[PDB]
């Protein structure tokens, strides 16, 4: 099962092991039980070069896990800006909605990642996107105490 | 708010026989919230070298902490733990009793 | 190892 | 015996000071093996065991990332919880969380669990099914709905059933000499004439591991959980624990009372008498 090894490597960050496994033919889009992808693992870990080697390997940029989170979601929450940028350049869906209705913009706002907020806005993220609760990113910013992000979003509306 | 007052215990890591190095423990359990102030005394005054474990909570959502120091017992020393917590209006002092 | 995907409350 | 990987997380809003304190502690059974403190300089998970230090840097990096994800998540939880409860900022509140997987003597997945507490009260718990949630209140009911929609239980299942067990087994292979031990309690009697008429016999147990121990009194066939005080099991800081129990007994008793002991360290119990 090459997919387990590739998943582990993306979790561990063996960039060379990642490349060799992709060469062997591992499914770039291999799915875990919870539907997390190597892309999600790479976003989480901040393994920029692994991210790029997966994307060049034709990784499904918009693959949704069982929670409905995309790699963009993971990157936004965890603050891996260069990954955010590489994903977006790869064609990630700025407005992708998880099973909760959170956008990556939501997560960036609520976790207070202003730089990522700005990159997402430059990438066409919907400031007005409402989650299942009806809460805008501005609300989640306020609730998290990221007042500057809150005012950036309210001004960018 | 729930307010819960610590169980305080003072003891030695090993039985206190003189001529032999050991450690003084003040053990605190069952307090909530975590904002205790606790200091170990000798002969009525604060020992500064006090050091403690990582903050952990019990099944009932109550914090417990160990404070311990190096010491050696004598027949003329007096040791006490002194603890203060929001539940305690005046800080409770419990002398070390070698039993 | 900690849980890798904790969700917010 | 049964073994547990236990992770304890606590967060406390510190208004005006501006950042919540966040403590994380992991245990394997009764042995603290990892830690985190927001206020420590390291900003890294730190080894508390000689076995865990064999774990290399890739893991400590990954655990740093995961514990900081716990930190941010518990932060936003604090804020969302104080939203649900509609309480003003001007006061400290606490969040704490605890999860882990338990294995039997075969080291198979025995049981997993996850729990959540707000303000010291039980807020949400994973039922043993690992599939449904016991909500405490309408706020926890809200979070129940959200977690159901998000399928949080499938995540928790996959972790607690999967990697948790793998890691726990590895640690027990590495703690082969420190978590597999049992230390049998050493015990002694003491006698004090607490009054001109009354006395106490006190039975001590100390220097035992694990913490689980039982001590009880009998008048040779009658229950003596009456004139008796008992203290919680307490840590020596040697990585071992202590406890004692006493009986308030008449002076000059004809060795009628006895201290009975049971601990997993004793293959033959060691009941002993005045």
């Amino acid at each position: 099962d090459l997919g387990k090894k590739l998943l582990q490597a993306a979790r561990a960050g063996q960039l060379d092991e990642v490349r060799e496994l992709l060469k062997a033919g591992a499914d770039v889009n291999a799915k875990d039980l919870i539907g997390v992808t190597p892309l999600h693992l790479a976003a989480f870990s901040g393994h920029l070069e692994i991210v790029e080697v997966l994307l060049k390997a034709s990784a499904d940029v918009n693959a949704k896990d069982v929670s409905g989170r995309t790699p963009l979601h993971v990157a936004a929450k965890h603050g891996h800006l260069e990954i955010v940028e590489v994903l977006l350049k790869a064609g990630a869906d700025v407005n992708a909605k998880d099973l909760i209705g959170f956008t990556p913009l939501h997560l960036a706002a609520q976790f207070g990642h202003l730089e990522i907020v700005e990159v997402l806005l430059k990438a066409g993220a919907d400031v007005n996107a409402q989650d299942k609760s009806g809460k805008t990113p501005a609300d989640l910013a306020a609730r998290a105490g990221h007042q500057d992000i809150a005012e950036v979003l309210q001004k960018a509306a | 708010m729930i307010q819960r007052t610590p169980k305080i215990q003072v003891y030695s890591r090993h039985p206190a026989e003189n001529g032999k190095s050991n450690f003084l423990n003040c053990y605190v359990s069952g307090f909530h919230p975590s904002d205790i102030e606790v200091d170990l005394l000798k002969n009525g005054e604060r020992i500064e070298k006090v050091e403690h474990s990582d903050l952990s909570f019990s099944k009932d959502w109550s914090f417990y902490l160990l404070y311990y120091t190096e010491f050696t017992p004598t027949e003329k020393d007096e040791y006490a733990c002194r603890v203060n917590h929001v539940t305690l209006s005046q800080p409770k002092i419990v002398k070390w009793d070698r039993d | 190892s900690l849980l890798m995907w904790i969700t917010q409350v | 015996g049964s073994h547990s990987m236990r992770y304890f997380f606590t967060s406390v809003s510190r208004p005006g000071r501006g950042e919540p304190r966040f403590i994380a502690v992991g245990y394997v059974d009764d042995t603290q093996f990892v830690r985190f403190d927001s206020d420590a300089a390291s900003q890294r998970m730190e080894p508390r065991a000689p076995w865990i230090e064999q774990e290399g840097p890739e893991y400590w990096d990954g655990e740093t990332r995961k514990v900081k994800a716990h930190s941010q998540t518990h932060r936003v939880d604090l804020g969302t919880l104080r939203g649900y409860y509609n309480q003003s900022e001007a006061g400290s509140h606490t969040v704490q969380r605890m999860y882990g997987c338990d294995v039997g003597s075969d080291w198979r997945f025995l049981r997993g669990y996850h729990q959540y507490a707000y303000d010291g009260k039980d807020y949400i718990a994973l039922k043993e099914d690992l599939r449904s949630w016991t909500a405490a209140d309408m706020a926890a009911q809200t979070t129940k709905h959200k977690w159901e929609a998000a399928h949080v239980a499938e995540q928790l299942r996959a972790y607690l059933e999967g990697t948790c067990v793998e890691w726990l087994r590895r640690y027990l292979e590495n703690g082969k000499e420190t978590l597999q031990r049992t230390d049998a309690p050493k015990t002694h009697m003491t006698h004090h004439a607490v009054s001109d008429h009354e006395a106490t016999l006190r039975c001590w147990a100390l220097s035992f591991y694990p913490a689980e121990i039982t001590l009880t009194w009998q008048r040779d066939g009658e229950d003596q959980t009456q004139d008796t005080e008992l203290v919680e099991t307490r840590p020596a800081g040697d990585g071992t624990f202590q406890k004692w129990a006493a009986v308030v007994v008449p002076s000059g008793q004809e060795q009628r009372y006895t201290c009975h002991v049971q601990h997993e360290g004793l293959p033959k119990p060691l009941t002993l008498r005045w």
Side-chain angles (χ1 to χ4, degrees):
Chain A
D1 186 349
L2 298 183
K4 78 170 57 187
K5 287 73 70 180
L6 187 64
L7 293 154
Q8 188 62 259
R11 196 202 320 285
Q14 303 70 357
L15 179 63
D16 289 354
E17 194 84 350
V18 165
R19 286 187 168 129
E20 66 186 4
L21 292 164
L22 290 167
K23 285 156 64 206
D27 188 356
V28 65
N29 315 304
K31 298 296 290 295
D32 257 322
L33 299 167
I34 63 168
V36 298
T37 73
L39 276 292
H40 296 119
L41 289 164
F44 173 88
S45 302
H47 289 301
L48 181 62
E49 295 77 12
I50 300 175
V51 165
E52 303 177 319
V53 170
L54 295 167
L55 296 168
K56 70 87 180 180
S58 309
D60 189 349
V61 68
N62 294 330
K64 300 166 170 59
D65 71 4
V66 298
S67 75
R69 300 276 172 84
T70 73
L72 196 50
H73 291 94
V74 176
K77 165 172 177 177
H78 299 70
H80 313 125
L81 182 77
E82 272 67 23
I83 305 163
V84 163
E85 304 170 345
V86 165
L87 297 161
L88 286 173
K89 304 252 171 53
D93 185 355
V94 74
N95 276 29
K97 307 293 286 294
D98 76 4
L99 280 146
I100 310 96
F102 288 154
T103 72
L105 194 59
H106 289 86
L107 299 175
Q110 198 186 19
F111 291 110
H113 305 311
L114 182 153
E115 66 285 19
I116 294 172
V117 160
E118 293 297 356
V119 162
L120 294 168
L121 293 177
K122 293 292 271 162
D126 183 332
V127 64
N128 273 343
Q130 295 184 1
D131 82 348
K132 72 175 292 176
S133 184
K135 295 194 278 191
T136 192
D139 310 342
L140 294 188
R143 177 87 43 98
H146 316 120
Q147 212 50 39
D148 46 8
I149 294 160
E151 285 301 275
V152 166
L153 298 167
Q154 304 149 354
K155 176 62 217 293
Chain B
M1 65 184 70
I2 81 180
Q3 298 302 13
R4 306 167 84 167
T5 300
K7 299 182 289 295
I8 321 169
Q9 292 194 20
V10 180
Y11 54 100
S12 60
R13 185 172 297 171
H14 305 99
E17 191 167 39
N18 313 336
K20 173 186 175 291
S21 57
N22 74 351
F23 309 78
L24 195 66
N25 304 310
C26 186
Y27 187 79
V28 188
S29 88
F31 55 105
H32 205 88
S34 190
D35 194 9
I36 45 169
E37 177 169 318
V38 61
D39 59 358
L40 288 61
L41 302 179
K42 188 207 189 187
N43 300 114
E45 64 185 5
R46 190 182 296 113
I47 191 169
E48 307 277 280
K49 198 179 39 180
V50 303
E51 73 173 60
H52 71 91
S53 185
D54 293 324
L55 192 74
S56 203
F57 64 77
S58 71
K59 299 292 180 181
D60 63 358
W61 318 106
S62 68
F63 310 114
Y64 73 92
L65 274 166
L66 182 58
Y67 289 72
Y68 69 101
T69 187
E70 182 65 26
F71 82 113
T72 186
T74 76
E75 297 311 304
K76 62 175 302 190
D77 298 347
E78 184 271 328
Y79 303 104
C81 186
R82 188 264 297 279
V83 182
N84 196 358
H85 186 266
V86 60
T87 61
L88 290 175
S89 57
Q90 188 277 330
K92 181 179 180 184
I93 303 170
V94 301
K95 286 149 283 302
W96 185 47
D97 190 296
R98 205 187 289 240
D99 172 6
Chain C
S1 303
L2 290 87
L3 171 53
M4 183 170 269
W5 299 281
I6 59 155
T7 303
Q8 63 181 265
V9 160
Chain D
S2 171
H3 300 276
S4 183
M5 195 188 291
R6 289 270 191 172
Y7 277 94
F8 310 71
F9 308 102
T10 191
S11 311
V12 185
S13 68
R14 309 186 291 198
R17 184 174 178 174
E19 190 175 330
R21 202 210 292 193
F22 173 98
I23 319 283
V25 182
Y27 309 77
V28 184
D29 305 351
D30 283 338
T31 316
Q32 205 181 316
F33 87 116
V34 295
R35 42 161 301 165
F36 198 95
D37 184 347
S38 62
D39 306 356
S42 193
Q43 296 296 299
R44 306 224 312 154
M45 286 212 120
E46 305 101 328
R48 320 299 322 181
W51 49 269
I52 207 54
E53 289 165 341
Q54 314 143 296
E55 190 66 27
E58 69 290 338
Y59 162 97
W60 300 94
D61 301 332
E63 294 336 279
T64 314
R65 287 183 293 260
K66 283 183 292 198
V67 176
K68 298 178 180 181
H70 288 61
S71 307
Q72 296 67 86
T73 310
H74 281 225
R75 200 191 297 142
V76 303
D77 296 347
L78 293 163
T80 308
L81 287 158
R82 161 186 54 58
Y84 294 157
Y85 291 104
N86 297 315
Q87 84 281 41
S88 307
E89 203 61 41
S92 178
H93 322 84
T94 191
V95 171
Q96 62 208 93
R97 180 190 193 129
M98 196 277 307
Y99 61 67
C101 73
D102 302 331
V103 304
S105 297
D106 197 47
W107 294 312
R108 302 291 75 67
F109 185 70
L110 184 80
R111 190 178 179 179
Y113 73 87
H114 171 289
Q115 312 182 283
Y116 199 98
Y118 177 61
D119 203 38
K121 304 177 294 290
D122 200 334
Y123 180 86
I124 279 280
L126 196 57
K127 305 185 57 43
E128 191 186 7
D129 75 353
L130 310 174
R131 294 166 180 78
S132 309
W133 304 100
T134 309
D137 273 333
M138 303 296 190
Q141 189 62 260
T142 311
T143 300
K144 186 178 166 191
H145 304 152
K146 292 177 72 179
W147 286 16
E148 287 265 318
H151 302 59
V152 174
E154 286 287 295
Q155 314 285 105
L156 272 286
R157 282 164 38 60
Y159 170 62
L160 299 173
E161 288 169 78
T163 74
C164 185
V165 177
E166 308 167 338
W167 295 90
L168 192 153
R169 299 172 296 169
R170 283 184 308 110
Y171 307 163
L172 281 53
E173 291 155 16
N174 302 337
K176 174 61 198 65
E177 298 297 328
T178 69
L179 300 173
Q180 306 311 102
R181 84 186 146 91
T182 47
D183 296 332
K186 297 180 174 180
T187 62
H188 65 283
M189 294 294 291
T190 62
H191 180 290
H192 300 82
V194 303
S195 76
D196 190 40
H197 303 80
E198 308 306 306
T200 55
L201 290 175
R202 167 150 48 231
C203 189
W204 285 87
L206 55 81
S207 182
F208 59 87
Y209 180 80
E212 180 58 14
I213 192 162
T214 55
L215 279 296
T216 193
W217 295 108
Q218 306 91 331
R219 197 167 64 191
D220 187 33
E222 298 183 315
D223 189 2
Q224 292 297 139
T225 190
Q226 299 183 3
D227 309 331
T228 285
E229 65 272 16
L230 182 64
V231 300
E232 293 82 8
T233 302
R234 68 199 192 180
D238 193 0
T240 51
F241 300 90
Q242 306 176 245
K243 188 173 71 68
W244 64 259
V247 61
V248 178
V249 61
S251 59
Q253 62 88 28
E254 304 90 339
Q255 309 171 264
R256 188 178 186 185
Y257 289 74
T258 286
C259 180
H260 291 74
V261 304
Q262 291 294 150
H263 185 270
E264 293 190 322
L266 288 59
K268 167 58 177 62
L270 200 68
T271 313
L272 204 48
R273 186 188 297 264
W274 182 231

